[PDB]
Structure formats: structure tokens, C-alpha cells
């Protein structure tokens, strides 16, 4: 129940404002900046502000804060969802999200803001559907918005029918300083770029553990996805009935399903790091990286970030494989490895100086995070079984998909 | 299939060597298609096994079945899920339609000795589907 959706800037100036109900004065935005400054300086800053009887709930963008004022007991989750949809629409329409496009795309920005939400209740949020009625370079609105299918425009024709899938894995490991992993969860991400003719009804089929158990084949390798979040095109009733994933793919790239299940296996990359930091004399980084993944998979662009001292200077890196560089901007040693074959072992021996004068305040111990990304390797073992592409006209589709394994929240707690 | 013919003798020898009663990860061949075994493909595989021998009358074992499924997946790209048998006790029919292979007693269904027996009626009659309509959807 947002009262006025406005876009701020880094200097407190409102780049664009669009009131939806008018129950909140437009002058309340001026007090948002002092309130945010006071909250930040006292540690009480939150995404949802409160200027007396009006709450300023907004998120932080790349360069401006999309603060949406409200007065009644409006849904905070609804406001956040509307802000996220607006950000996604802006990203789809404008390749950059900064002040350069706010002051240059006002003619289309105002129209998009007016069409997106009326009276604080959003009605249209599909970028592809919205691009057929509001353009910066007007006909009647498309029937897709009025029709039930609001995520697949009818009449789309292509020379070929090729759909590219992307099974992107997110290996997140929360390893404590004691050497044990606390939070080790893998979140799947099935992002497909559907490019077909017409409005095909894709029938996604995978080797799900529940599906295998229901069919009676609960004995082979099946992915045990604890949480499965289907897209808007995916029919919730069909999935709830008999695990049938049937939905109409959209035109372009979109996220169909987002699996998320816990992982009880050993980490793909094991980092054994030591800190022989002398008392204001020197420091040693005996960091060893052990690859527990399969030898047939190579972790391309492996970047194990080792947090070095903030005031360390004149550092020396004695590694074996991969270039090691220290970035003073990040205050850490980036153990960058181009190709990391499975089962390999890279040993590094850091050595950096330290000023004689001790630091005035503590700096903390940021966790060490690795940036391993091994393509063609599915840690969860989930494999796509079938993709039922059915069209009324009748055509031979050529679906495609690739499996990519990377590191998500794979941080290692320091000592 | 020259590759299938070559792999049939080695697969049969490995199955015979394994008695009737280390590397982590799931590597995938780049560009290799993966899909469930079809009824026609299952029928062709059953016919080839019957003609070449080594599968009809062999003692059914978990290790031998797993090795055969892995070899079939490696040589054809078929998932190792269509080589399933109906629950016992007694004669177990193939879960996938078109398969000509079935398990029959040779003497709890787990301790019962079973052997692979060719059955041409499996490719035409859905014995497994009729026995377990719920499992077939």
C-alpha cells in the first residue's frame, strides 16, 4: 500500500517521484535523508524508515534509493516486491541503473511508473509484455495482459526453435574457524532462454527423488531438492498433484525453477590456511588449497580470497600454481588460478611486513571466500530427463541445456 | 553398433566375474545426449543381448545389473533407470515398456535367487504397468 513511489540519489535529491494515492505530502522526502543519516550514524538504519506517521520503506539501488512512502499499515513485503519489479523493469529497459538514465529517460520513465501501479496496487510487471505498450522510441494494450497468460506473448515466430538451458549450481559452504563446515547448502538455478515459435507448453522432466519414488524408481541417482520454487509460468497445481512441471516458457531468458537442498558431501575445494603473524614484525600465510572435486572437472577461474592485514606493506607471495596478487583496495590476497584440475593441490607461502606502531582500532577477521567455478560438473547430481515441447501447429524443437558448477556463499571462517 | 558389439563381450565378462551375491563427482561427457531409454531402444538391446547371449539365464545380482546399466549409459547415453524390475516375490517384469528381460526365480523376495530370462511378450504386453498402474502414472 505505497503512497508515493520516488527515486532518490546519493546527494538526497529525488531524481523522480510518482505519487499513487496522495495521502503523503511530497515534502516528507526531504526528511528521509536526515533520518537515514541519523540511523546510519547510530547503527539503527533500516530499509524501512519512519517519519512520524509516514513510513519510508525502500531498498538501496546502484546509485539511488527507491524509497516508497506510505502512511497506513501497508504490506512491507508487497512494497518490497513492487520495488524489485520496478528495478527489474528498469534494468530490462535501461542497461545501466544510475543517474545518467533517470534524467535522460523521464518521458518513458513517467509512463512506465504510471502504467506499472495505480492507486498503490501494481497491475503489470512483465518487462516483455510492458515493452509492447510503453516505448521510448501508442497502440492498444496487448491481449496478454488481459488474458491469463501474461508471460508469453502470442504470435511469436522464429526461423528455428532452439531453447538453451543453464543448470547453474551454487556451492555455498560456511566453514568455521575450527575447521568444520556449519552451513553447507547448494541452491540450484534452472535458467532457460526459450526461443521458439508460438506459445509452446514446456513439460520439464528431471530425475527428482519424489518423482522417482512415485514412479517406483527410487533407487538410482535422484536429486533431493528440499525446496523447489517454480516460476510464474510453471503451474503450481500440476506440480502439487503428481510432480508435473508443465508451463509455457516465456520469450527470452528467465528463471524457470530454483531448487535449494542441503549438501552433506565434502567441499569441492578445501583450504588449509595458517597465520604466522608476528607481533608487529611480519606475517606468514601458509595457505594450501586441496581440490576434493572429481579429477575430470576443472575449476576454471579459481580465485581463493585470503584476507591479509589492512596495513600490511611490502608483501611477498611464494606459491606453486596460479598468480597471487594483493589488492590494497580490498585488503586481501587474491589467490587467482586460471585452471584448477580436480584433485590438484596448490601451496602458497605469504610473507608481508607490518608497521612497528600498532593499529588504533581492531579491523576484524573477514572470512576467506573462494571463487571456484567448475563447468560441466553437477554437485547435486540432478540431470534433466525430458522437456515436453508441445505446440498446436506442430514443430520439432531443439532444446539445449548446460550444467555449470560455481561457488556461492563458500566462505571459510578465519582464526 | 560396432561399439555396442565390442562392449558386449567385456560387459558379459565383467558380469560373470562379479559374484551373484573411490572417485567422487558425476562427470558428464560434453555434448553427449542424455535421455531415458526408449521402448524401441530397449527392445533392440534385449534382442541383441539374446542373440549374443550372456544375459539370458545369468544369475541376477545388484552389481551385475549396475555394471550393465553403466555400460549401456556409457555406450548409448541412456539413463540407468529403465532397467528396473517389478517387486517380488516371484517373477519380476521390467519397469520400462519394451524390455525383453525379466527376473524369474531359480530355486522374502530379497533373498530369493533370480536370473535374467528373455521374454518377447514384455515388449508387447505392459506386465509391469498392469501390475503397478500407480507406478506408471
Amino acid at each position: 500500500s505505497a503512497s508515493a513511489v520516488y527515486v532518490l540519489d546519493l546527494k538526497g535529491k529525488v531524481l523522480i517521484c510518482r505519487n499513487y494515492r496522495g495521502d503523503v505530502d511530497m515534502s516528507e522526502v526531504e526528511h528521509f535523508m536526515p533520518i537515514l543519516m541519523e540511523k546510519e550514524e547510530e547503527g539503527m538504519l533500516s530499509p524501512i524508515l519512519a517519519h512520524g506517521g509516514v513510513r519510508f520503506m525502500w531498498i538501496k539501488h546502484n546509485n539511488l534509493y527507491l524509497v516508497a512512502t506510505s502512511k497506513k499499515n501497508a504490506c512491507v513485503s508487497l512494497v518490497f516486491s513492487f520495488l524489485y519489479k520496478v528495478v527489474q523493469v528498469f534494468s530490462e529497459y535501461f542497461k545501466e541503473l544510475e543517474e545518467e538514465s533517470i534524467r535522460d529517460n523521464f518521458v518513458i520513465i513517467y509512463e512506465l511508473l504510471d502504467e506499472l501501479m495505480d492507486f498503490g496496487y501494481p497491475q503489470t510487471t512483465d518487462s516483455k509484455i510492458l515493452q509492447e505498450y510503453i516505448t521510448q522510441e501508442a497502440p492498444r494494450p496487448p491481449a496478454t495482459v488481459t488474458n491469463a497468460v501474461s508471460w508469453r506473448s502470442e504470435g511469436i515466430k522464429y526461423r528455428k526453435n532452439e531453447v538453451f538451458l543453464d543448470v547453474i549450481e551454487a556451492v555455498n559452504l560456511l566453514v568455521s574457524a575450527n575447521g568444520n563446515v556449519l552451513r553447507s547448502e547448494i541452491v540450484g538455478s534452472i535458467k532457460m532462454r526459450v526461443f521458439l515459435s508460438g506459445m509452446p507448453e514446456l513439460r520439464l522432466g528431471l530425475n527428482d527423488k519424489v518423482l522417482f519414488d512415485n514412479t517406483g524408481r527410487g533407487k538410482s541417482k535422484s536429486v533431493e531438492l528440499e525446496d523447489v520454487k517454480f516460476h510464474q509460468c510453471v503451474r503450481l497445481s500440476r506440480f502439487e498433484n503428481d510432480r508435473t512441471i508443465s508451463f509455457i516458457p516465456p520469450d527470452g531468458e528467465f528463471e524457470l525453477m530454483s531448487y535449494r537442498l542441503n549438501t552433506h558431501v565434502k567441499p569441492l575445494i578445501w583450504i588449509e590456511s595458517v597465520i604466522e603473524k608476528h607481533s608487529h614484525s611480519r606475517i606468514e600465510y601458509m595457505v594450501k588449497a586441496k581440490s576434493q572435486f572429481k579429477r575430470r572437472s576443472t575449476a576454471n577461474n579459481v580465485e581463493i580470497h585470503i584476507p591479509v592485514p589492512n596495513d600490511a606493506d611490502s608483501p611477498k607471495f611464494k606459491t606453486t600454481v596460479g598468480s597471487v596478487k594483493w589488492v590494497p583496495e580490498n585488503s586481501e590476497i587474491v589467490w587467482s588460478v586460471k585452471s584448477f584440475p580436480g584433485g590438484k593441490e596448490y601451496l602458497m607461502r605469504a610473507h608481508f611486513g607490518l608497521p612497528s606502531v600498532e593499529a588504533e582500532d581492531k579491523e576484524g577477521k573477514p572470512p576467506i571466500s573462494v571463487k571456484f567455478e567448475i563447468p560441466y560438473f553437477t554437485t547435486s547430481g540432478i540431470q534433466v530427463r525430458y522437456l515436453k515441447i508441445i505446440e498446436k501447429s506442430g514443430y520439432q524443437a531443439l532444446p539445449w541445456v548446460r550444467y555449470i558448477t560455481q561457488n556461492g556463499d563458500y566462505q571459510l571462517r578465519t582464526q | 553398433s560396432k561399439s555396442s558389439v565390442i562392449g558386449w563381450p567385456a560387459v558379459r565378462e565383467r558380469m560373470r566375474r562379479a559374484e551373484p551375491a573411490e572417485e567422487v563427482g558425476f562427470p558428464v561427457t560434453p555434448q553427449v545426449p542424455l535421455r531415458p531409454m526408449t521402448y524401441k531402444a530397449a527392445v533392440d538391446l534385449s534382442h541383441f543381448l539374446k542373440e549374443k547371449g550372456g544375459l539370458e539365464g545369468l544369475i541376477h545380482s545388484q552389481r551385475r545389473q549396475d555394471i550393465l546399466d553403466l555400460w549401456i549409459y556409457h555406450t548409448q547415453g541412456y539413463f540407468p533407470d529403465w532397467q528396473n524390475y517389478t517387486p517380488g516375490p516371484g517373477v519380476r517384469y521390467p519397469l520400462t515398456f519394451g524390455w525383453c528381460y525379466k527376473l524369474v526365480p531359480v530355486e522374502d523376495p530379497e533373498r530369493e535367487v533370480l536370473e535374467w530370462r528373455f521374454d518377447s511378450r514384455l515388449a508387447f504386453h505392459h506386465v509391469a504397468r498392469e501390475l503397478h498402474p500407480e507406478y506408471f502414472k
Binding site: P375, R385, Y386, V401, I404 | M37
Partner: peptide, 18 residues
Amino acid sequence: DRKGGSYSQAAGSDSAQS
């Protein structure tokens, strides 16, 4: 070619489940 694993063709449905 493509970084992150070469794209592989997908099947149409579970042919082994009818």
C-alpha cells in the same frame, strides 16, 4: 565452445516410464 560447460541437448520425456 562456451565457458561453464558445453550445452547438451535435452530429451522430450521419460521414455522409460511410458
